[PDB]
Amino acid sequence: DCERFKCPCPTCGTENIYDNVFDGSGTDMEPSLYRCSNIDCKASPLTFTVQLSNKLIMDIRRFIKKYYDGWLICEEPTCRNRTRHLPLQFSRTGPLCPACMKATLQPEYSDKSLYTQLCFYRYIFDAECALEKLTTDHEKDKLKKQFFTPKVLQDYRKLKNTAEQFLSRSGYSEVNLSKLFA
């Protein structure tokens, strides 16, 4: 239930979506960044790592934009109010809508989303894992023989690194034990 990664082609003009590292079917499977999807055109988007890099940041830097600006929405499935001026009264679940005075209020982009999505990015740029988890010997050996240079790997490494550091920067993966057992 997150939002996929859409991508603009630098030459053919078409668009793309990058869901899982491998692009589909089994023994055929190929790396995502290899060939533009549009059948005919033959440009290979990998060779534009840096450009991808840009959009990556220039995309994430709106998701965060939402959260710290987080909407507030109503719960009693009739009222359906949308505002931000957090009111001050409180109860078990939290605060209370001013109009439907018999109901709670909920965040819209629940942080769980934000962290989920950042995991979703860091997923599809870290092929190394999904490569290791693969079962069949011969498939692994043949594909690696085929097209896993240090170069391609390194480029994945680069963008994946950007993502991972940018979330682990500081929000959520930590749980400060020094306040949890006092």
Binding site: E174, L177, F181
Partner: protein, 434 residues
């Protein structure tokens, strides 16, 4: 074997990965449940009870050979595992009991393998009096030790590193006249050393345990740790082995044939029932229904099966479309995720969903009353001795093992191959042996 063996203390205020957190949680809980099962199966000293555990335990990253101070991997894992699950069971006596009891027996086992020198020296590192005799005193005091206590036979006492004690903690080894005395520095075989260690451990451990339970509210202001806030013992397994879309493809007709040899009692009896009735209530099917995805037949094929079993029992051939079949189909749609989009696990057909009059969904071994169930199971052509030893565990209110022993008998194979947790896993096995 590792340094690991240690008396829990001093919460390690690091700061860590949320992923690793829930990982350790699940791992440790698995270890606990397992140890309990493995134990209640056999008796302690049997070498199955050793082999199996020393396999599993080593498999889940907790016991290897020598390494650095404390940031060696498996000891750290053990450490943070416990000092998390501490937050698990702070809300019952029965719970805190079960947790203590299990950790107790684990430590017993996991400790019973250390080399003797490592044993005594680490006891030394533990507290003060944990010190050993000189074996010369074995010769010097064989008469005293042997004739004193009945806890030793003849003269053949092995080369155990016997121990010097303060009587002040011998509080049962001596009053029962079970040891020689040298000014309260009685000398006792290792057995009672383990005993006393374990008893002081239980004491101190409970004494700590109660404290956190008296200091809960902190977590209440977070919800990342919402599962382990109070959500472990519930309707998720170890994990989803027999999940959506695993190995299987079989045509309709064969089902009944396979039934007589492959359907775990709950299912089997429900399928007999719907073979007779050809009608079921609002909730009932929603077990059997998803259970069929266990083998994973196609909807229109499953729809056809149910249609046969519906209109032959006179269910209006028009209702079917806008009624049952509708939801039966949706059972593979958008919402149902972890609610319907999954099969069921015994810990969902036990811990909840009360079965009502004359209905069939629900664990027989729980809901079926004892002796009615006795004749009932017996009707599966079962030796009454097996039935009896089964009903024993059944009133021991631990049932998975009962299902287990039943299968073990009905196929006569003298290993359960696993520790069952899901009826569909049971099924995949039953088909494996063919």
């Amino acid at each position: 074997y590792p340094h690991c063996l240690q008396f829990y203390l001093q919460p390690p205020s690091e700061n860590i990965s949320l992923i690793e957190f829930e990982n350790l949680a699940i791992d440790r809980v698995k270890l606990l449940k397992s140890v309990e099962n493995l134990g209640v199966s056999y008796v302690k000293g049997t070498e199955q009870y050793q082999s199996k555990l020393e396999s599993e335990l080593r498999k889940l990253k907790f016991s290897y050979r020598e390494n650095l101070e404390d940031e060696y991997e498996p000891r750290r894992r053990d450490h943070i595992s416990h000092f998390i699950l501490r937050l698990a069971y702070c809300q019952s006596e029965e719970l805190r009991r079960w947790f203590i009891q299990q950790e107790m027996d684990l430590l017993r086992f996991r400790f019973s393998i250390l080399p003797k020198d490592k044993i005594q020296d680490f006891l030394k590192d533990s507290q003060l009096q944990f010190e050993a005799i000189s074996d010369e005193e074995k010769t010097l005091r064989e008469q005293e030790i042997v004739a004193s206590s009945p806890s030793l036979s003849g003269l053949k006492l092995g080369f155990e590193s016997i121990y010097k004690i303060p009587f002040a903690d011998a509080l049962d080894l001596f009053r029962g006249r079970k040891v020689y005395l040298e000014d309260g520095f009685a000398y006792v075989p290792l057995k009672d050393i383990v005993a006393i260690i374990l008893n002081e451990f239980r004491a101190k451990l409970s004494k700590a345990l109660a404290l956190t339970a008296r200091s809960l509210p902190a977590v209440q202001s977070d919800e990342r740790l919402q599962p382990l806030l109070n959500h472990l013992s519930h309707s998720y397994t170890g994990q989803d082995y027999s999940t959506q879309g695993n190995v299987g493809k079989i045509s309709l007709d064969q089902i009944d044939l396979l039934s007589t040899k492959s359907f775990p009692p709950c299912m089997r009896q429900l399928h007999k029932a719907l073979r007779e009735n050809h009608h079921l209530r609002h909730g009932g099917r929603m077990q059997y229904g998803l259970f069929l995805k266990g083998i994973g037949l196609t909807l229109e094929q499953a729809l056809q099966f149910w249609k046969q079993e519906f209109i032959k029992g006179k269910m209006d051939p028009d209702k079917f479309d806008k009624g049952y079949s509708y939801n039966i189909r949706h059972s593979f749609g958008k919402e149902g995720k972890r609610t319907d989009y999954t099969p069921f696990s015994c810990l969902k057909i036990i811990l909840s969903n009360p079965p009502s009059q004359g209905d069939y969904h629900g664990c027989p071994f729980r809901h079926s009353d004892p002796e009615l169930l006795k004749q009932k199971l017996q009707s599966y052509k079962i030796s009454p001795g097996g039935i009896s030893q089964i009903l024993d565990l059944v009133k021991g209110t631990h049932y998975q093992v009962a299902c287990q022993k039943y299968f073990e008998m009905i196929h006569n194979v003298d290993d359960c191959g696993f520790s069952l947790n899901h009826p569909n896993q049971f099924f995949c096995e039953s088909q494996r042996i063919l």
